[PDB]
Each structure stands twice: as structure tokens, then as C-alpha cells.
Design a protein around this nucleic acid. Sequence first.
RNA 1: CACAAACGCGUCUCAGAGAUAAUUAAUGAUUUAAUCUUAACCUAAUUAACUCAUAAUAAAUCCAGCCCUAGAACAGGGCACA
Lengths: 162, 266, 38, 42, 38, 71, 177, 99
Amino acid sequence: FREVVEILDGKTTIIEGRITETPQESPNPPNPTGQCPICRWNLKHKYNYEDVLLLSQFIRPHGGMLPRRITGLCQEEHLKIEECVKMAHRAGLLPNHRPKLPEGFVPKSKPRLNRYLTRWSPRSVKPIYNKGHRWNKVRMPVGSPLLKDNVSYSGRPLLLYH
Amino acid sequence: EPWPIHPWEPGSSRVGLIALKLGMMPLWTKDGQKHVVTLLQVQDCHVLKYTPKENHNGRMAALTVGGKTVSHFHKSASILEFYQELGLPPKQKVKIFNVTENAVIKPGTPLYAAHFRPGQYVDVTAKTIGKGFQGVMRRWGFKGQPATHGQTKTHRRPGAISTGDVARVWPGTKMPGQLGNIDRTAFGLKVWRINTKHNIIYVNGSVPGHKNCLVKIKDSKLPAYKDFCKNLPFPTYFPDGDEEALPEDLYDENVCQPGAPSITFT
Amino acid sequence: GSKAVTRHRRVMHFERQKLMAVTEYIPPKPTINPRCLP
Amino acid sequence: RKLIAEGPGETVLVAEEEAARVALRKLFGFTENRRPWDYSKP
Amino acid sequence: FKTKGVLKKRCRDCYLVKRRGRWFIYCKTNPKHKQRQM
Amino acid sequence: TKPIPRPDPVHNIEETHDLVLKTRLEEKGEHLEQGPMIEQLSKMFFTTKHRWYPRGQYHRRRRKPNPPKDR
Amino acid sequence: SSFSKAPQQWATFARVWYLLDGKMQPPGKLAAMASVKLQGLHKPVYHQLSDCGDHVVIMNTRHIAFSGNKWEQKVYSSHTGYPGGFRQVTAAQLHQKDPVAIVKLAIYGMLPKNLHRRTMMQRLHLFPDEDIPEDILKNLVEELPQPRKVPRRLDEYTQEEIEAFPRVWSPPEDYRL
Amino acid sequence: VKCTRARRLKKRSLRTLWINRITAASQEHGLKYPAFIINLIKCQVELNRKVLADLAIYEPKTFKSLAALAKRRREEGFAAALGDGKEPDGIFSRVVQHR
RNA sequence: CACAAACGCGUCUCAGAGAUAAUUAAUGAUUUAAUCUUAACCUAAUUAACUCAUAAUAAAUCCAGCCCUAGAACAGGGCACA
Ligand SMILES: [Mg+2]
Ligand SMILES: [Mg+2]
Ligand SMILES: [Mg+2]
Ligand SMILES: [Mg+2]
Ligand SMILES: [Mg+2]
Ligand SMILES: [Mg+2]
Ligand SMILES: [Mg+2]
Ligand SMILES: [Mg+2]
Ligand SMILES: [Mg+2]
Ligand SMILES: [Mg+2]
Ligand SMILES: [Mg+2]
Ligand SMILES: [Mg+2]
Ligand SMILES: [Zn+2]
Ligand SMILES: [Zn+2]
């Protein structure tokens, strides 16, 4: 990991890069022949928004996403993991991955409403006043459609709109 | 045995009175304008009981105030027992005032019309003149039908009351009924003159309710005069606390007093 | 009674809708995704 | 510290009385789970 | 802003951004190119 | 299991006159109106106020005087 | 087993008080079991004509959780009867105004549409937080399990489990976070 | 006419009541009604819903034994399905012919 | 205006907080640039509605008769000053 350090000493700005030690991959993956990290660790169709230990491996400390060219995931898993990270952040997981704002934490607001499996943004969805009748009903989407391929032990399909 | 007096606070509220509406009088201002004042006489104002804030509302305490004296021979057993325990004769009208916990007064305390000083805004609550079961034209002000252009038995009918497709009338439909005998409140009534000897308050504008009726007077709750109680006596007016007799009539800075030099413009 | 060819998509009978749903195309799905495969 | 009987009740005293009645019935053998009376020809 | 069903860039400086659940073609050089997907 | 709670307290006992003390715990009575009584009963039994109201002659006459009983 | 008729009847048709935690729980799944317990559908002696009904006390109502964007999309519409008196309140606004109302309406909808719905609703107790009067606390018999398992946060995971969980990918040293 | 219609519907109503009571008594043992019924049938125990409801109401020990048998049969079936082995057979999954 | 009242043509009063839709900019990744974000963290300028402070009622079992600015009847307020 690289860190940028700025030093101010008498109208002089010193910008330096510092390299720190970084953790490495575990020695024994279950499927070493797999090119993709998730696809070789056999976590494909296994992870979800609840699995925070996997989603937290590759994210910026401020909650930002990480580039695929650096991560190495396949496109579908990259999109699915991006959706899962967004869902976890909206649900309230990863509490330590928010920017530190000393000024903004004093003026408290309304308590955060508990939520999970949230698909859209909380500030962009207008309430459905019509709600539709039985034949034509405006169903409420829950969860991301990219996670419809996960393993279903019960075998019942995951209701993405309710 | 007075209760401790707390200092005035910006978020505090004061207790009101229960007066009697005498009548209406004119009053001229130093600028030549003429206003109409109503005389409210505080005959017998006494604090009857005190209810805790938690046991009444959870935000503000409640103080009970009684009106003018009535006869013992026409009141109920429980009311007579309550007044016997209190030590005071029964009152006619009994009202509840929402006051802050720092302005509480011991029950049995009398109150005087000097509680309001010349120049203040008060709210007046009373039962208006009850006109009984009146027609729709007098009640809601609906226009009537033409008088003589052939209209038959319709000069004051309300007319249509709903629509055809609805097949019913909405609950908010305006219809003839009882009119007048309801409690109404007038806000922002300015007080000009305070007569101490007779306990008379001169309130600007009309007062809801007929003459010789009980009127509940309180401070103005309007945001324009939310913090006008700073200069007023916070707990109440104590005639014994100052040990000084107030003048017979306290006037406002603009009221043309009866003894005047007959002001002329320049 | 409508004509054989119409503009309003000529909503089908329930049995025909069931037949269409049953006969919908099913693409062949391999066991292992070949993108990240060796 | 060995449970011999138990009884329900509306109040504690009534429940205790019912428990005592159940224990007495169990001791005397007159229980709902007892042997039915023998109606045969010896 | 012009409300349209289909958005297309009228110049090379127009950028498409997803905001408030809709798509917006924003242009700084030509403000008349502001398009909002309905 | 837990031990049986026992509550025995006689606060009406008077050292001057036990005869009056005994009647002090028995002279308790109260009467309320129909509305408040029904509300109190509903609050006690966690039911609605509609059940406690009486019934008319037509329904009270048609009740079976001797309903069948099993067991 | 060998009880008298009156105590046996009282034991058979005795009422039971249940407890239900509502923190981080879906209102629909809470209301399902609440309705089951209120109707008495958990008793083999249940019958529609019989008054078999159990009390349910639900706590931590303010901390309820909705799946998806239901907080922003779900609406509750009421009408005062007067013209122009039709109001539509969002789920978030209704919860802010009254925490109880959400689960109360959910249970009211899930309960059967007969006249016994009011009677069985009067037996229901809902509290926004873990502040229950002692007269109600002394009546609780058992606590029903939460229908939804509350997921852990990242900081709630133990360091031994964090280290046990393998690192899937190895970040390069040259990259900057 | 209503008497005839209700006489026809009485069988359905009482069957539904028995099913509801069985569901209550089975969920009291932590077992679902469809699984309980299919596993009791797989054990060649031909008891109708009326008898099952009577046992649930008046024979709690017998109903718990039946629920335990059904759960054991369900576990044996799941184990057999997971194993996919012809030789491994459960103790309670054995089929007995008529005699 | 030939009743002590009613009435207008005559007189008095009329309000604070939150919240938003469209639309602005701050910080920031996917897409180490930028980018108001169906990415989060707090953001700030913000329509009308809509709720809430606040305001009104809010002391149970005396009611024969006589008055009332209270009233269709039923109800309600008074009958000690004099
Ligand atoms: Mg009148
Ligand atoms: Mg006219
Ligand atoms: Mg004519
Ligand atoms: Mg005429
Ligand atoms: Mg004619
Ligand atoms: Mg109609
Ligand atoms: Mg044809
Ligand atoms: Mg048949
Ligand atoms: Mg940047
Ligand atoms: Mg810019
Ligand atoms: Mg309010
Ligand atoms: Mg009276
Ligand atoms: Zn891959
Ligand atoms: Zn452009």
C-alpha cells in the first residue's frame, strides 16, 4: 500500500510516497487452476450482502470501490460485488469505512432507519401512491437481480420484486 | 406560606385570569385615532388546585383558576366538599391554564387585574352569543335565491347539497344547525388601561361572548409576542410584595388620558 | 369477435399462453463458466 | 426433591389443593390411567 | 432542460450522468443541450 | 422451580377497637356508571366494550334452558 | 393427567403471554407469528367459536427494519371522511410520527377480517423500546425466536474469525488506497 | 337448501379444522405439516387427520412419538438422497409388503 | 331600529418548527482525472401541500319551582349580598 505524506515547514511543501507492508493471499486455494480470484476460491454463487469479510477485502477505506484491472475479478462477479457493497453500505454494514468528519458528527439528525437488501438509493425513489390493482401491480423491488444465480438450498426462487 | 418564586426564563409561560365582561367604551389615542375597548372586571380570581406536569400533559403544568362567587345552595356535594377543603366559596366558571413548572403558584392564592400591565397582548376565550338553531344563510353566509322572480318556497333554502354520482352527502357539508353557543378565542387583543381599584382591564377590540359573562384571559401565544413577559411580574402581581399602592389607573404611552391638555397638532 | 390479424397484439387464449410459456426457449447452460476457466 | 404430583389452578392456594388431590389419588391408585373394571365371567 | 424519451449528445462536451434516478445530458459550453430522460 | 410467594398483610387492624377494625376491611364498596363500569371490565379482561352490554328479550327468550352436557 | 374438571378446563384453556423482540426484524415476519399467536393457531385445541387467544408483547418497535426501499416507497393512505381529507403518509414518515403504527397496521392487516379481530387486537401490546411496565413483565411466559437472523457488522466480527477467513486476492504494493 | 349445502361443506370444514390442529401440534414440536404427513405416510402408518387431531388433543406423548418418527423418517430420506447409495438403507425406510 | 335585543353599511383578530418535487454547488470510486451519488458519510439554497408545537373543551351522581344575553322539546347558566 502506498501513502502520500505532505509536510509543511516554512513555506515549503514536501510531498513524499511511503510504501507499507500489505497482506498476501492464503497459500492454499481450493481451486488453484482458476484464473479469477473468486472463481478459484469457489466463492462464486456463494457470497451475499451478509458476507462482510469477503466484501471488505477490496474496498477503499472511505467506502469507495476498487478498479477491476487491479482486483482481477471477472466482469459479472465485479458487478455483483459492487452491488453487494452498495447494499451493505446502505444497510449500515462496514461502519468503519466512512470518512471521518469531526464537524459533521456533532449535529445529529433523525435516527438511521434499519434496512437491508436495498436496491435503489434512499434519496432517489418516489413513493408509489397508486400501488396498482391485482392484475397490474407496481411491485416493490428488493435485492439485486445480479444475485439471482446464487445457490438455493431450499430450491425456491428468490423474490426480487415484493 | 408562599411557594418559592423562580426567576423568569425565556421559555416560561404565565398564568391567566377569569374576568367578567362589563361593556364597551371608546378610547382616543394621542395620534387622533379612536379605538374601542372592552371592560373585563376581575371580581374573584383564585387558584383552586395544582396539577403536576407529568400528571397533566408531560410538558407543562396545569393551574386551575376559579371565577366569581356563587351560592352554596345550588352546587353539588362533591364541588361543595372540594371548596370546603380549599377554604373558599364556590366559583361559577372553573378553567385550566397551561403554565410552565417555574411559574407555579400555591392553590388558594388570589389574583388581581394588575397581573396585566398597560401595553400587552392577551388572548380571550369565552362562549360566544348563542343564536340557537339558525338557518344556513345566517350560519354559513350562503346567498339566497331571488326574492320575486318566480321562486317558490326557496328564498332561504340551501339549495343543492351534494352531487348525483356520489349518491351521498359529505360529512363536511355546511347545513343549518346550532350556531353561537361554542367556545371561541380571540388572539392578539392589546390592553391599554388598567384600573386597579375596581380591577378593570381595557382590552382592545371585540370580546367574544355576551356582556356580564365569564371570560378566560391569558397572555398572547402568537410568535410576535412570545417573550413579552420579561418585564411583567413573573409569578403574579402581589399587592403585598411591593408595599406600595399602585395608581388608580395605569395608562399606556399612547392613551389620551381623561385629564389631558386637549392636544393640538403642530 | 375480432379479425385474425389485428393491431392490438390480439391477446391470446389462456391455454395458448400456457403453451407458449412451456415452449419458451431454454439456452444450454454449461456447468462451468468458460471465461475464467483455464 | 422428587416430584410426585402437580396441579393447576386459578390461584396459588387452589393449585396447591389440586396438587394435593392429585397426589392423594395417585397414592390411592384411583387415577384416570388405572385399570378399567373387569366385566367378565369367572 | 428539455424532457425527452431518448437522449443524444448534440456536441462533444455533453456528458451523460445518472442523477435522482434519471439520465441527464449536461453541457457546459451550450446550456441549451440540457436533456432529461423521462 | 421457584418458591411459592405468600402475601399476608392486614393494614386495617386497630389497637383501639378490633371489632371496628374487622369491619374496616369489609365495608369497602363502590358504584360506577354503565360506561365506566364496562370500560373497567374491558380493561381488566383485555376485551372490547361491546361484549358487556346486555341483550334484548328476543335473544334472551330463545336461549336453551337445559343445554345438553357431555362427559 | 388426573385433574378435576374445573382445573383441567382452566389449564387447557389458559391464556399465555409471549414476548417478541422487534429489533432488526421485518414487520411482515413479526406480524405472521403475532397473528398466529393471537388467533391461537398454535394450539391443538383451537376453534373459531372458542375464545382461545394468547397475548403477545412486542418490544424494540422503533428499531424495526424494512427489506429493500420499502421505507421510501411503501405508503399508508387514510381518509377522514371530509372532502379533501385523504392523506397518504410514507412509511418512514409514519414510523417517525408513531413507531407503533407500522407493526400495528401490519398485524391488523394479517389478522382475519371478522369481528374477533378487534377482540384479539385488544390483547396485543406494542412498545417502541425495552420499557415495559412490571405488571406486564410479570406475565411473560416465554420469548419467541426472532424470525430473521441479524447480520453482523464488520467491527462485530472477532479477530480470530477475521484471520481464519482467507484473503482471496493479493493487492499490489505499488497501488495507493 | 342451505342445510344441504352446509351438510356437504361440513366434511371440508372439519377436515380443515383437523388440519389446522395438526399444524399447531406439529409446529409445537418444530415440524412442518407437509413434511410430517409425507414422512408418516412413508412409514406405512395410515392415520387420517381426524385420528391425528384426536391424538394431538388427548395423547400428547403419542403425538410426540409420531412426530419423532416422522422426523427420523425425514432425516433418513435426506441422508439417502445425499448418499445416492443403493446399499445404505435406513432402519425406518424399509418397506413391508402385505401379509 | 316606537322591546332592554338583533343586524351591516359599522368595529376587532388572523400565527412558529420540520418536511419536501423540480433545480443548484462541496467531498468522493467504480472510471486513483473529472462526475450533486436507482455508491455511501454528513452536506448546504430550496414550491405548495402535510403533520407538530401552540390554542379550545377537559372539577361526575342537589336539582322541585322562578329568571337568563341559554334554548324547538330535551339540555345549560344563575336564585346570600341588593
Ligand atoms: Mg341564545
Ligand atoms: Mg339576497
Ligand atoms: Mg312558479
Ligand atoms: Mg315566495
Ligand atoms: Mg306552484
Ligand atoms: Mg355510494
Ligand atoms: Mg371470430
Ligand atoms: Mg360424499
Ligand atoms: Mg478524484
Ligand atoms: Mg465542477
Ligand atoms: Mg397538536
Ligand atoms: Mg344547571
Ligand atoms: Zn471470474
Ligand atoms: Zn453540448
